[PDB]
Design a protein around this ligand. Structure first.
Ligand SMILES: Nc1ncnc2c1ncn2[C@@H]1O[C@H](COP(=O)(O)CP(=O)(O)OP(=O)(O)O)[C@@H](O)[C@H]1O
Ligand SMILES: N#Cc1ccc(CSc2nc3c(=O)[nH]c(N)nc3[nH]2)cc1
Ligand SMILES: [Ca+2]
Ligand SMILES: [Ca+2]
Ligand SMILES: [Ca+2]
Ligand SMILES: [Ca+2]
Ligand SMILES: [Cl-]
Ligand SMILES: [Cl-]
Ligand SMILES: [Cl-]
Length: 159
């Protein structure tokens, strides 16, 4: 078993409903069990700002799936919750499931890059992660607590 950490985001079609539905679906992923769910946070959109606020959260998922097998399921869940691809980069979405970490693994396949390439710069990923895994150490040895102690991130507000 490996513990994967998954970021959840939603800013369309009732984000609270989307995220609660996603938690049920995450539980139904085979060879896998949810260990921990963060609080839900209402976060201002970063990147394009002409969209509704996000609900962001994080979950710890213990799994014996291969990393790309886990991605298969997270993509399936997004699609089954009505995620539609539009032309605009970083457009709003019903559900976004990013694999932040897969144990201590460093993965670089065509479909999957882990750790998530930008997570160390995103409070909306790091704060919910710290809530569920305050002792976390990244594959490069960096400590989550040290990043959050040192780097300026805006305080998150709960949903
Ligand atoms: N760690 C990871 N988690 C989820 N998908 C990943 C991933 N690494 C690579 N991908 C790939 O990322 C592709 C595009 O996903 P998108 O959801 O459109 C990017 P996004 O989440 O909107 O922006 P972001 O990656 O800047 O957070 C997926 O089709 C998947 O193959
Ligand atoms: N700066 C910056 C920046 C940060 C993230 C992104 C990816 S698109 C995106 N996803 C999210 C998300 O889940 N939450 C919030 N609050 N903003 C987002 N923006 C693009 C640019
Ligand atoms: Ca399961
Ligand atoms: Ca826009
Ligand atoms: Ca994302
Ligand atoms: Ca994504
Ligand atoms: Cl809602
Ligand atoms: Cl969508
Ligand atoms: Cl790392």
């Amino acid at each position: 078993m490996t513990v994967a950490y998954i970021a959840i985001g939603s800013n369309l079609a009732s984000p609270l409903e989307q995220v609660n539905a996603a938690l049920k679906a995450l539980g139904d992923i085979p060879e896998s069990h949810i260990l921990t769910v963060s609080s839900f946070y209402r976060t201002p959109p970063l990147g394009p700002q002409d969209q509704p606020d996000y609900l962001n959260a994080a979950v710890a998922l213990e799994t014996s799936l291969a990393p790309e097998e886990l991605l298969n399921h997270t993509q399936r869940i997004e699609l089954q919750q009505g995620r539609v691809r539009k032309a605009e980069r970083w457009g709003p979405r019903t559900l976004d499931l990013d694999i932040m970490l897969f144990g201590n693994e460093v993965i670089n396949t065509e479909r999957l890059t882990v750790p998530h390439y930008d997570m160390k710069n995103r409070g909306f990923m790091l704060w919910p992660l710290f809530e569920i895994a305050p002792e976390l150490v990244f594959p490069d040895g960096e400590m989550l607590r040290q990043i959050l102690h040192t780097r300026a991130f805006d305080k998150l507000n709960k949903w």
